[PDB]
Amino acid sequence: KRYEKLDFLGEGQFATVYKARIVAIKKKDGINRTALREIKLLQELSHPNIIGLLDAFGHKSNISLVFDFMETDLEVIIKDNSLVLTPSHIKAYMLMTLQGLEYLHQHWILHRDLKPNNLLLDENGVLKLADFGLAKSFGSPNRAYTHQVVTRWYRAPELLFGARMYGVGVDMWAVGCILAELLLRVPFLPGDSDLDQLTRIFETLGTPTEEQWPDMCSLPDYVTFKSFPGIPLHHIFSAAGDDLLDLIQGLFLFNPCARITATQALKMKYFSNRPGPTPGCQLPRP
Amino acid sequence: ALYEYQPLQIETYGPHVPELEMLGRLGYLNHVRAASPQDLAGGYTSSLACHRALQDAFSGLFWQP
Amino acid sequence: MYHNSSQKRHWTFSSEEQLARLRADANRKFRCKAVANGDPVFLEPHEEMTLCKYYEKRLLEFCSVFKPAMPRSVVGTACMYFKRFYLNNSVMEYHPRIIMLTCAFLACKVDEFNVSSPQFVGNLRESPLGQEKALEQILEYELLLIQQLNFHLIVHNPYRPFEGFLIDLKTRYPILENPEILRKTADDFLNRIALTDAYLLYTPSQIALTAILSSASRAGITMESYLSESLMLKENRTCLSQLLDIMKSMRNLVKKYEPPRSEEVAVLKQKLERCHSAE
Ligand SMILES: COc1ccccc1CNc1cc(NC[C@H]2CCNC[C@@H]2O)nc2c(C(C)C)cnn12
């Protein structure tokens, strides 16, 4: 085509990503449904904090997708010991993630794969949601989805309890986990199994009650845990202010209906309080 | 260099859709199927279906090709 | 959302004349290729349109008896794919019986209607070897169909707007005591609007509202106050004029629709298979 290969960027089990000239090219059942999902969703979306699909082409039952080239991701930022993550940096990353997510949610799409390495960063410091291979439209009672979505460490408790019907909470919980990972620099809730994921969630944040989550027991794979009191958030996050703790509390509410939406999160005092989010050019470059 | 919220202003080219919060107040939710407790526990409410249906009904109703 | 969708941006055209131009370009360009390769073998554009209408009916009833039951959104997506494909391609180059199956096959994936290729092809009345050969043909044409759609796969159908209008009527228009009796006759009218080119000329909301008001008129209920005071069009008079004109134009597209004649199709199919056996 009109794109000359320059570098090999990565290998996921459904596609090989390579730099090209700068863009990133991602190369009996027919064309793969993950690629078709990416095409069909990203063609209908245009926002600065969502990865832009620039073109698609291919041959036979193969296909390649052209994307804006991204410099790094949030996982590399988190794991880089030499980068100090000031509160302004965390505010900037959260703001961009939430604005992209607000736009995505107004168009009735859930990302369902939010994690630090899916929050890509470009050379201008602009964060973009990427990897829409699990993304799906929501708001339709005619559609029933799967619960195993979202990587385990970022999977919301209603997904772990097996919710076949869910809204934006599955994204917001992951957002909270990402936020926690930005604060602690280690995965907040690193469960090695779904049961162990729920165990770590309840050990840290407390076992929810009926008042906390009225229909908790109606989820098909619900199962009862020991009453863990939970660790108060200000003990877990010892350097966070009250505004940040309120945001974290909102993102980790066990009730998915009560869990704060992207719009509600953006309206919180934390984002409007001092200090302001750093400009993109000043964000730390690994 | 502080941030302030400003809502997404995207032209729908159609009649105004009432907010999620107001749908029960305005009597819309009387005409959609209620969310089951299993659906509610996952965060799915009838308000979502109602809001999306109204948004699609009004989207581009006035637009000319 | 429709209002910033690819369907609105690229696949809603100004007039029926423009669609006629696009189809004429397609027919002319295939004729130029056929003469540059090696007379009344060719189909005229109205002959192509007759065959396209016949094969769209075939696509409809293929989806109608498809097992497992196919959602209406998938069917509408597949029909829109068929219409869009033949705007810029000739039935003499790509056979509509393969293309309609490919459209259904792709719409099943796009609308997340999980179907295995074996159970997709099991719906064809063919010997198993014929099912395999059909599947191979579909897999051959899948990327071609996607390219000819310009990778615009999300199709906004009138069904959810229809439901939303019913909600809004039940909630805000009490003088229509029971809007639900408007459903059947509106649905019928939607099905007629779908046979025309309206899906390429009007927004899905406009189509749904036209069907609803046509149903109300068939029941002799007037709905001018729903438009003027509920949708608040009495405050922007030119908007009400434009909307009423759109709905009248749609009703006339349905009025002047001519189904393919069976003798016509019988002859045109022989011409089409003659075109595809040769070349
Ligand atoms: C090696 O240096 C790094 C390091 C970290 C992040 C990015 C780069 C280089 N750039 C890059 C890699 C990349 N890897 C494929 C997936 C891997 C799992 N997480 C989602 C990713 O997309 N994908 C893209 C895109 C598109 C295809 C979204 C645009 N840039 N880019």
Side-chain angles (χ1 to χ4, degrees), chain A residues 8-12 17 23-26 38 51 65 67-73 76 115 117-118 120-121 130-131:
Chain A
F8 161 96
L9 289 180
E11 155 80 335
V17 180
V23 304
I25 314 284
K26 174 183 298 194
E38 208 136 65
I51 189 81
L65 308 186
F67 292 97
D68 298 288
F69 167 67
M70 299 313 281
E71 159 157 299
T72 179
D73 56 47
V76 181
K115 58 172 143 71
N117 75 50
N118 279 343
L120 307 188
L121 269 289
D131 212 310

PDB file of all heavy atoms in Angstrom, chain A residues 8-12 17 23-26 38 51 65 67-73 76 115 117-118 120-121 130-131, ligand 1:
ATOM      1  N   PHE A   8       8.785  -3.112  14.116  1.00  0.00           N
ATOM      2  CA  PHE A   8       7.806  -3.998  14.726  1.00  0.00           C
ATOM      3  C   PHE A   8       7.492  -3.485  16.126  1.00  0.00           C
ATOM      4  O   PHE A   8       8.399  -3.293  16.943  1.00  0.00           O
ATOM      5  CB  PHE A   8       8.337  -5.435  14.755  1.00  0.00           C
ATOM      6  CG  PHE A   8       7.648  -6.342  15.744  1.00  0.00           C
ATOM      7  CD1 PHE A   8       6.616  -7.170  15.333  1.00  0.00           C
ATOM      8  CD2 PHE A   8       8.043  -6.391  17.072  1.00  0.00           C
ATOM      9  CE1 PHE A   8       5.986  -8.008  16.224  1.00  0.00           C
ATOM     10  CE2 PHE A   8       7.415  -7.229  17.966  1.00  0.00           C
ATOM     11  CZ  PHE A   8       6.386  -8.043  17.540  1.00  0.00           C
ATOM     12  N   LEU A   9       6.214  -3.245  16.398  1.00  0.00           N
ATOM     13  CA  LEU A   9       5.798  -2.664  17.668  1.00  0.00           C
ATOM     14  C   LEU A   9       5.303  -3.689  18.668  1.00  0.00           C
ATOM     15  O   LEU A   9       5.634  -3.592  19.850  1.00  0.00           O
ATOM     16  CB  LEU A   9       4.710  -1.611  17.443  1.00  0.00           C
ATOM     17  CG  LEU A   9       5.174  -0.317  16.775  1.00  0.00           C
ATOM     18  CD1 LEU A   9       4.013   0.648  16.604  1.00  0.00           C
ATOM     19  CD2 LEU A   9       6.300   0.329  17.562  1.00  0.00           C
ATOM     20  N   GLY A  10       4.527  -4.674  18.240  1.00  0.00           N
ATOM     21  CA  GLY A  10       4.044  -5.661  19.180  1.00  0.00           C
ATOM     22  C   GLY A  10       3.340  -6.795  18.476  1.00  0.00           C
ATOM     23  O   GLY A  10       3.045  -6.731  17.279  1.00  0.00           O
ATOM     24  N   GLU A  11       3.075  -7.840  19.248  1.00  0.00           N
ATOM     25  CA  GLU A  11       2.338  -9.008  18.783  1.00  0.00           C
ATOM     26  C   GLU A  11       1.265  -9.326  19.814  1.00  0.00           C
ATOM     27  O   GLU A  11       1.577  -9.779  20.921  1.00  0.00           O
ATOM     28  CB  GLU A  11       3.279 -10.195  18.565  1.00  0.00           C
ATOM     29  CG  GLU A  11       2.639 -11.581  18.671  1.00  0.00           C
ATOM     30  CD  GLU A  11       1.894 -12.011  17.419  1.00  0.00           C
ATOM     31  OE1 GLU A  11       1.453 -11.140  16.642  1.00  0.00           O
ATOM     32  OE2 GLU A  11       1.757 -13.236  17.208  1.00  0.00           O
ATOM     33  N   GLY A  12       0.010  -9.049  19.471  1.00  0.00           N
ATOM     34  CA  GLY A  12      -1.118  -9.604  20.176  1.00  0.00           C
ATOM     35  C   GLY A  12      -1.637 -10.801  19.406  1.00  0.00           C
ATOM     36  O   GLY A  12      -1.408 -10.936  18.205  1.00  0.00           O
ATOM     37  N   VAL A  17       1.402  -5.432  15.316  1.00  0.00           N
ATOM     38  CA  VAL A  17       1.423  -3.981  15.206  1.00  0.00           C
ATOM     39  C   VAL A  17       2.824  -3.541  14.827  1.00  0.00           C
ATOM     40  O   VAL A  17       3.808  -3.948  15.457  1.00  0.00           O
ATOM     41  CB  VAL A  17       0.973  -3.294  16.510  1.00  0.00           C
ATOM     42  CG1 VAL A  17       1.006  -1.787  16.346  1.00  0.00           C
ATOM     43  CG2 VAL A  17      -0.415  -3.761  16.890  1.00  0.00           C
ATOM     44  N   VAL A  23       2.425   6.363  11.450  1.00  0.00           N
ATOM     45  CA  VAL A  23       1.209   5.697  11.884  1.00  0.00           C
ATOM     46  C   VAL A  23       1.586   4.323  12.416  1.00  0.00           C
ATOM     47  O   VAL A  23       2.701   3.837  12.218  1.00  0.00           O
ATOM     48  CB  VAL A  23       0.171   5.570  10.747  1.00  0.00           C
ATOM     49  CG1 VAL A  23      -0.145   6.938  10.158  1.00  0.00           C
ATOM     50  CG2 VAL A  23       0.667   4.612   9.676  1.00  0.00           C
ATOM     51  N   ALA A  24       0.649   3.712  13.118  1.00  0.00           N
ATOM     52  CA  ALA A  24       0.779   2.331  13.546  1.00  0.00           C
ATOM     53  C   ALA A  24      -0.190   1.486  12.737  1.00  0.00           C
ATOM     54  O   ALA A  24      -1.379   1.806  12.658  1.00  0.00           O
ATOM     55  CB  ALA A  24       0.495   2.193  15.042  1.00  0.00           C
ATOM     56  N   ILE A  25       0.312   0.419  12.126  1.00  0.00           N
ATOM     57  CA  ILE A  25      -0.515  -0.497  11.356  1.00  0.00           C
ATOM     58  C   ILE A  25      -0.703  -1.766  12.167  1.00  0.00           C
ATOM     59  O   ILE A  25       0.274  -2.387  12.605  1.00  0.00           O
ATOM     60  CB  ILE A  25       0.092  -0.822   9.983  1.00  0.00           C
ATOM     61  CG1 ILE A  25       0.581   0.446   9.294  1.00  0.00           C
ATOM     62  CG2 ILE A  25      -0.921  -1.579   9.123  1.00  0.00           C
ATOM     63  CD1 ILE A  25      -0.503   1.285   8.717  1.00  0.00           C
ATOM     64  N   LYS A  26      -1.953  -2.143  12.360  1.00  0.00           N
ATOM     65  CA  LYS A  26      -2.325  -3.376  13.026  1.00  0.00           C
ATOM     66  C   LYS A  26      -2.811  -4.356  11.968  1.00  0.00           C
ATOM     67  O   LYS A  26      -3.847  -4.128  11.343  1.00  0.00           O
ATOM     68  CB  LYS A  26      -3.413  -3.094  14.064  1.00  0.00           C
ATOM     69  CG  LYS A  26      -4.004  -4.298  14.732  1.00  0.00           C
ATOM     70  CD  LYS A  26      -5.127  -3.904  15.677  1.00  0.00           C
ATOM     71  CE  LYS A  26      -4.634  -3.007  16.797  1.00  0.00           C
ATOM     72  NZ  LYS A  26      -5.636  -2.906  17.889  1.00  0.00           N
ATOM     73  N   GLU A  38     -13.304  -3.255  16.031  1.00  0.00           N
ATOM     74  CA  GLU A  38     -12.501  -2.039  16.053  1.00  0.00           C
ATOM     75  C   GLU A  38     -12.899  -1.100  14.924  1.00  0.00           C
ATOM     76  O   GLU A  38     -13.116   0.097  15.147  1.00  0.00           O
ATOM     77  CB  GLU A  38     -11.020  -2.396  15.963  1.00  0.00           C
ATOM     78  CG  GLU A  38     -10.102  -1.396  16.620  1.00  0.00           C
ATOM     79  CD  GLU A  38      -9.020  -2.060  17.450  1.00  0.00           C
ATOM     80  OE1 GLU A  38      -8.172  -2.768  16.871  1.00  0.00           O
ATOM     81  OE2 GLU A  38      -9.020  -1.870  18.683  1.00  0.00           O
ATOM     82  N   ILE A  51      -8.488   6.780  20.357  1.00  0.00           N
ATOM     83  CA  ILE A  51      -7.539   6.500  19.286  1.00  0.00           C
ATOM     84  C   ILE A  51      -8.240   6.613  17.941  1.00  0.00           C
ATOM     85  O   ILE A  51      -9.357   6.114  17.755  1.00  0.00           O
ATOM     86  CB  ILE A  51      -6.889   5.119  19.482  1.00  0.00           C
ATOM     87  CG1 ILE A  51      -5.736   4.914  18.498  1.00  0.00           C
ATOM     88  CG2 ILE A  51      -7.900   3.995  19.356  1.00  0.00           C
ATOM     89  CD1 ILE A  51      -4.457   5.569  18.916  1.00  0.00           C
ATOM     90  N   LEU A  65      -5.359  -2.267   9.793  1.00  0.00           N
ATOM     91  CA  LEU A  65      -5.954  -1.038  10.296  1.00  0.00           C
ATOM     92  C   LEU A  65      -4.852  -0.018  10.534  1.00  0.00           C
ATOM     93  O   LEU A  65      -3.792  -0.361  11.060  1.00  0.00           O
ATOM     94  CB  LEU A  65      -6.716  -1.303  11.594  1.00  0.00           C
ATOM     95  CG  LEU A  65      -7.733  -2.437  11.506  1.00  0.00           C
ATOM     96  CD1 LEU A  65      -8.552  -2.551  12.780  1.00  0.00           C
ATOM     97  CD2 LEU A  65      -8.617  -2.204  10.308  1.00  0.00           C
ATOM     98  N   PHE A  67      -3.722   3.453  12.433  1.00  0.00           N
ATOM     99  CA  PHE A  67      -4.004   4.230  13.627  1.00  0.00           C
ATOM    100  C   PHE A  67      -2.956   5.321  13.755  1.00  0.00           C
ATOM    101  O   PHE A  67      -1.845   5.199  13.239  1.00  0.00           O
ATOM    102  CB  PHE A  67      -3.947   3.380  14.902  1.00  0.00           C
ATOM    103  CG  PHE A  67      -5.025   2.358  15.016  1.00  0.00           C
ATOM    104  CD1 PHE A  67      -4.794   1.045  14.647  1.00  0.00           C
ATOM    105  CD2 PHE A  67      -6.262   2.699  15.519  1.00  0.00           C
ATOM    106  CE1 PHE A  67      -5.782   0.099  14.769  1.00  0.00           C
ATOM    107  CE2 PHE A  67      -7.253   1.754  15.643  1.00  0.00           C
ATOM    108  CZ  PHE A  67      -7.016   0.455  15.267  1.00  0.00           C
ATOM    109  N   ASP A  68      -3.308   6.376  14.483  1.00  0.00           N
ATOM    110  CA  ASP A  68      -2.294   7.317  14.932  1.00  0.00           C
ATOM    111  C   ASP A  68      -1.247   6.578  15.753  1.00  0.00           C
ATOM    112  O   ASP A  68      -1.565   5.664  16.514  1.00  0.00           O
ATOM    113  CB  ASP A  68      -2.926   8.439  15.760  1.00  0.00           C
ATOM    114  CG  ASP A  68      -3.922   9.267  14.966  1.00  0.00           C
ATOM    115  OD1 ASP A  68      -3.490  10.046  14.093  1.00  0.00           O
ATOM    116  OD2 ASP A  68      -5.138   9.139  15.211  1.00  0.00           O
ATOM    117  N   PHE A  69       0.014   6.951  15.564  1.00  0.00           N
ATOM    118  CA  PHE A  69       1.102   6.321  16.296  1.00  0.00           C
ATOM    119  C   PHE A  69       1.186   6.896  17.705  1.00  0.00           C
ATOM    120  O   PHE A  69       1.149   8.116  17.892  1.00  0.00           O
ATOM    121  CB  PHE A  69       2.424   6.512  15.554  1.00  0.00           C
ATOM    122  CG  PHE A  69       3.636   6.180  16.375  1.00  0.00           C
ATOM    123  CD1 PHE A  69       3.890   4.877  16.768  1.00  0.00           C
ATOM    124  CD2 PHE A  69       4.523   7.170  16.747  1.00  0.00           C
ATOM    125  CE1 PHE A  69       5.010   4.572  17.526  1.00  0.00           C
ATOM    126  CE2 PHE A  69       5.641   6.872  17.502  1.00  0.00           C
ATOM    127  CZ  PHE A  69       5.884   5.572  17.891  1.00  0.00           C
ATOM    128  N   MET A  70       1.297   6.014  18.692  1.00  0.00           N
ATOM    129  CA  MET A  70       1.336   6.386  20.098  1.00  0.00           C
ATOM    130  C   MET A  70       2.713   6.081  20.675  1.00  0.00           C
ATOM    131  O   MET A  70       3.292   5.027  20.398  1.00  0.00           O
ATOM    132  CB  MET A  70       0.254   5.649  20.886  1.00  0.00           C
ATOM    133  CG  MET A  70      -1.168   5.941  20.416  1.00  0.00           C
ATOM    134  SD  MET A  70      -1.531   7.688  20.164  1.00  0.00           S
ATOM    135  CE  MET A  70      -1.797   8.215  21.850  1.00  0.00           C
ATOM    136  N   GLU A  71       3.233   7.014  21.469  1.00  0.00           N
ATOM    137  CA  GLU A  71       4.607   6.925  21.956  1.00  0.00           C
ATOM    138  C   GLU A  71       4.768   5.890  23.065  1.00  0.00           C
ATOM    139  O   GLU A  71       5.739   5.127  23.067  1.00  0.00           O
ATOM    140  CB  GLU A  71       5.062   8.305  22.429  1.00  0.00           C
ATOM    141  CG  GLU A  71       6.232   8.313  23.384  1.00  0.00           C
ATOM    142  CD  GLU A  71       6.973   9.639  23.365  1.00  0.00           C
ATOM    143  OE1 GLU A  71       7.495  10.014  22.298  1.00  0.00           O
ATOM    144  OE2 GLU A  71       7.032  10.309  24.413  1.00  0.00           O
ATOM    145  N   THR A  72       3.841   5.843  24.010  1.00  0.00           N
ATOM    146  CA  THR A  72       3.974   5.000  25.196  1.00  0.00           C
ATOM    147  C   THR A  72       2.574   4.765  25.753  1.00  0.00           C
ATOM    148  O   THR A  72       1.575   5.164  25.144  1.00  0.00           O
ATOM    149  CB  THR A  72       4.918   5.641  26.218  1.00  0.00           C
ATOM    150  OG1 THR A  72       5.020   4.809  27.382  1.00  0.00           O
ATOM    151  CG2 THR A  72       4.418   7.018  26.621  1.00  0.00           C
ATOM    152  N   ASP A  73       2.491   4.100  26.901  1.00  0.00           N
ATOM    153  CA  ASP A  73       1.208   3.897  27.553  1.00  0.00           C
ATOM    154  C   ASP A  73       1.362   4.155  29.044  1.00  0.00           C
ATOM    155  O   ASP A  73       2.456   4.424  29.544  1.00  0.00           O
ATOM    156  CB  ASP A  73       0.641   2.498  27.283  1.00  0.00           C
ATOM    157  CG  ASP A  73       1.581   1.382  27.693  1.00  0.00           C
ATOM    158  OD1 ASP A  73       2.131   1.421  28.813  1.00  0.00           O
ATOM    159  OD2 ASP A  73       1.759   0.447  26.889  1.00  0.00           O
ATOM    160  N   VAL A  76       3.770   1.702  31.180  1.00  0.00           N
ATOM    161  CA  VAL A  76       5.193   2.036  31.159  1.00  0.00           C
ATOM    162  C   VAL A  76       5.476   3.205  32.093  1.00  0.00           C
ATOM    163  O   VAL A  76       6.499   3.232  32.786  1.00  0.00           O
ATOM    164  CB  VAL A  76       5.651   2.341  29.720  1.00  0.00           C
ATOM    165  CG1 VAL A  76       7.133   2.653  29.687  1.00  0.00           C
ATOM    166  CG2 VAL A  76       5.335   1.177  28.800  1.00  0.00           C
ATOM    167  N   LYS A 115      -7.338  -0.570  31.125  1.00  0.00           N
ATOM    168  CA  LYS A 115      -6.181  -0.894  31.945  1.00  0.00           C
ATOM    169  C   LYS A 115      -5.043   0.021  31.512  1.00  0.00           C
ATOM    170  O   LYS A 115      -5.125   0.637  30.448  1.00  0.00           O
ATOM    171  CB  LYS A 115      -5.793  -2.377  31.813  1.00  0.00           C
ATOM    172  CG  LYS A 115      -5.482  -2.837  30.413  1.00  0.00           C
ATOM    173  CD  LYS A 115      -4.929  -4.247  30.434  1.00  0.00           C
ATOM    174  CE  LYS A 115      -5.414  -5.052  29.247  1.00  0.00           C
ATOM    175  NZ  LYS A 115      -4.786  -4.595  27.983  1.00  0.00           N
ATOM    176  N   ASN A 117      -2.114  -0.234  30.140  1.00  0.00           N
ATOM    177  CA  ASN A 117      -1.471  -0.355  28.837  1.00  0.00           C
ATOM    178  C   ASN A 117      -2.437  -0.153  27.674  1.00  0.00           C
ATOM    179  O   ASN A 117      -1.997  -0.166  26.521  1.00  0.00           O
ATOM    180  CB  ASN A 117      -0.719  -1.694  28.736  1.00  0.00           C
ATOM    181  CG  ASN A 117      -1.625  -2.891  28.531  1.00  0.00           C
ATOM    182  OD1 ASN A 117      -2.493  -2.909  27.663  1.00  0.00           O
ATOM    183  ND2 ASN A 117      -1.397  -3.924  29.327  1.00  0.00           N
ATOM    184  N   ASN A 118      -3.728   0.023  27.942  1.00  0.00           N
ATOM    185  CA  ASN A 118      -4.682   0.437  26.922  1.00  0.00           C
ATOM    186  C   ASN A 118      -4.912   1.943  26.912  1.00  0.00           C
ATOM    187  O   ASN A 118      -5.671   2.436  26.075  1.00  0.00           O
ATOM    188  CB  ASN A 118      -6.011  -0.296  27.109  1.00  0.00           C
ATOM    189  CG  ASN A 118      -5.983  -1.689  26.526  1.00  0.00           C
ATOM    190  OD1 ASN A 118      -5.119  -2.009  25.717  1.00  0.00           O
ATOM    191  ND2 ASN A 118      -6.927  -2.526  26.931  1.00  0.00           N
ATOM    192  N   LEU A 120      -3.049   4.835  25.886  1.00  0.00           N
ATOM    193  CA  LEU A 120      -1.821   5.158  25.181  1.00  0.00           C
ATOM    194  C   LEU A 120      -1.557   6.654  25.212  1.00  0.00           C
ATOM    195  O   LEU A 120      -2.470   7.465  25.351  1.00  0.00           O
ATOM    196  CB  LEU A 120      -1.884   4.671  23.735  1.00  0.00           C
ATOM    197  CG  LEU A 120      -2.246   3.199  23.542  1.00  0.00           C
ATOM    198  CD1 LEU A 120      -2.084   2.808  22.091  1.00  0.00           C
ATOM    199  CD2 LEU A 120      -1.396   2.312  24.421  1.00  0.00           C
ATOM    200  N   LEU A 121      -0.286   7.012  25.101  1.00  0.00           N
ATOM    201  CA  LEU A 121       0.155   8.395  25.132  1.00  0.00           C
ATOM    202  C   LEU A 121       0.932   8.697  23.859  1.00  0.00           C
ATOM    203  O   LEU A 121       1.714   7.863  23.393  1.00  0.00           O
ATOM    204  CB  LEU A 121       1.040   8.664  26.356  1.00  0.00           C
ATOM    205  CG  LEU A 121       0.417   9.157  27.668  1.00  0.00           C
ATOM    206  CD1 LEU A 121      -0.054  10.601  27.549  1.00  0.00           C
ATOM    207  CD2 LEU A 121      -0.718   8.257  28.136  1.00  0.00           C
ATOM    208  N   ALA A 130      -7.455   3.062  23.727  1.00  0.00           N
ATOM    209  CA  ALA A 130      -7.142   2.213  22.591  1.00  0.00           C
ATOM    210  C   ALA A 130      -7.634   0.802  22.866  1.00  0.00           C
ATOM    211  O   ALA A 130      -8.185   0.507  23.929  1.00  0.00           O
ATOM    212  CB  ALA A 130      -5.643   2.207  22.286  1.00  0.00           C
ATOM    213  N   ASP A 131      -7.415  -0.073  21.882  1.00  0.00           N
ATOM    214  CA  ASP A 131      -7.785  -1.480  21.955  1.00  0.00           C
ATOM    215  C   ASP A 131      -9.280  -1.690  22.161  1.00  0.00           C
ATOM    216  O   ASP A 131      -9.709  -2.162  23.218  1.00  0.00           O
ATOM    217  CB  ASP A 131      -7.000  -2.193  23.054  1.00  0.00           C
ATOM    218  CG  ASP A 131      -6.722  -3.638  22.712  1.00  0.00           C
ATOM    219  OD1 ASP A 131      -7.680  -4.344  22.328  1.00  0.00           O
ATOM    220  OD2 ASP A 131      -5.550  -4.063  22.809  1.00  0.00           O
TER     221      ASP A 131
HETATM  222  C1  LIG D   1       6.834  -0.124  22.135  1.00  0.00           C
HETATM  223  O1  LIG D   1       6.535   1.213  22.422  1.00  0.00           O
HETATM  224  C2  LIG D   1       5.274   1.400  22.996  1.00  0.00           C
HETATM  225  C3  LIG D   1       5.113   1.147  24.348  1.00  0.00           C
HETATM  226  C4  LIG D   1       3.878   1.318  24.940  1.00  0.00           C
HETATM  227  C5  LIG D   1       2.799   1.741  24.184  1.00  0.00           C
HETATM  228  C6  LIG D   1       2.961   1.995  22.832  1.00  0.00           C
HETATM  229  C7  LIG D   1       4.200   1.831  22.228  1.00  0.00           C
HETATM  230  C8  LIG D   1       4.413   2.089  20.731  1.00  0.00           C
HETATM  231  N1  LIG D   1       3.215   2.397  19.962  1.00  0.00           N
HETATM  232  C9  LIG D   1       2.067   1.513  19.827  1.00  0.00           C
HETATM  233  C10 LIG D   1       2.087   0.206  20.289  1.00  0.00           C
HETATM  234  C11 LIG D   1       0.947  -0.580  20.139  1.00  0.00           C
HETATM  235  N2  LIG D   1       0.936  -1.949  20.610  1.00  0.00           N
HETATM  236  C12 LIG D   1      -0.216  -2.801  20.413  1.00  0.00           C
HETATM  237  C13 LIG D   1      -1.189  -2.878  21.661  1.00  0.00           C
HETATM  238  C14 LIG D   1      -0.493  -3.533  22.799  1.00  0.00           C
HETATM  239  C15 LIG D   1      -1.431  -3.688  24.003  1.00  0.00           C
HETATM  240  N3  LIG D   1      -2.073  -2.388  24.386  1.00  0.00           N
HETATM  241  C16 LIG D   1      -2.699  -1.697  23.226  1.00  0.00           C
HETATM  242  C17 LIG D   1      -1.706  -1.529  22.074  1.00  0.00           C
HETATM  243  O2  LIG D   1      -2.368  -0.914  20.976  1.00  0.00           O
HETATM  244  N4  LIG D   1      -0.108  -0.051  19.534  1.00  0.00           N
HETATM  245  C18 LIG D   1      -0.105   1.227  19.080  1.00  0.00           C
HETATM  246  C19 LIG D   1      -1.116   2.012  18.449  1.00  0.00           C
HETATM  247  C20 LIG D   1      -2.508   1.575  18.009  1.00  0.00           C
HETATM  248  C21 LIG D   1      -2.461   0.248  17.264  1.00  0.00           C
HETATM  249  C22 LIG D   1      -3.566   1.596  19.110  1.00  0.00           C
HETATM  250  C23 LIG D   1      -0.545   3.245  18.193  1.00  0.00           C
HETATM  251  N5  LIG D   1       0.682   3.239  18.676  1.00  0.00           N
HETATM  252  N6  LIG D   1       0.942   1.977  19.226  1.00  0.00           N
END
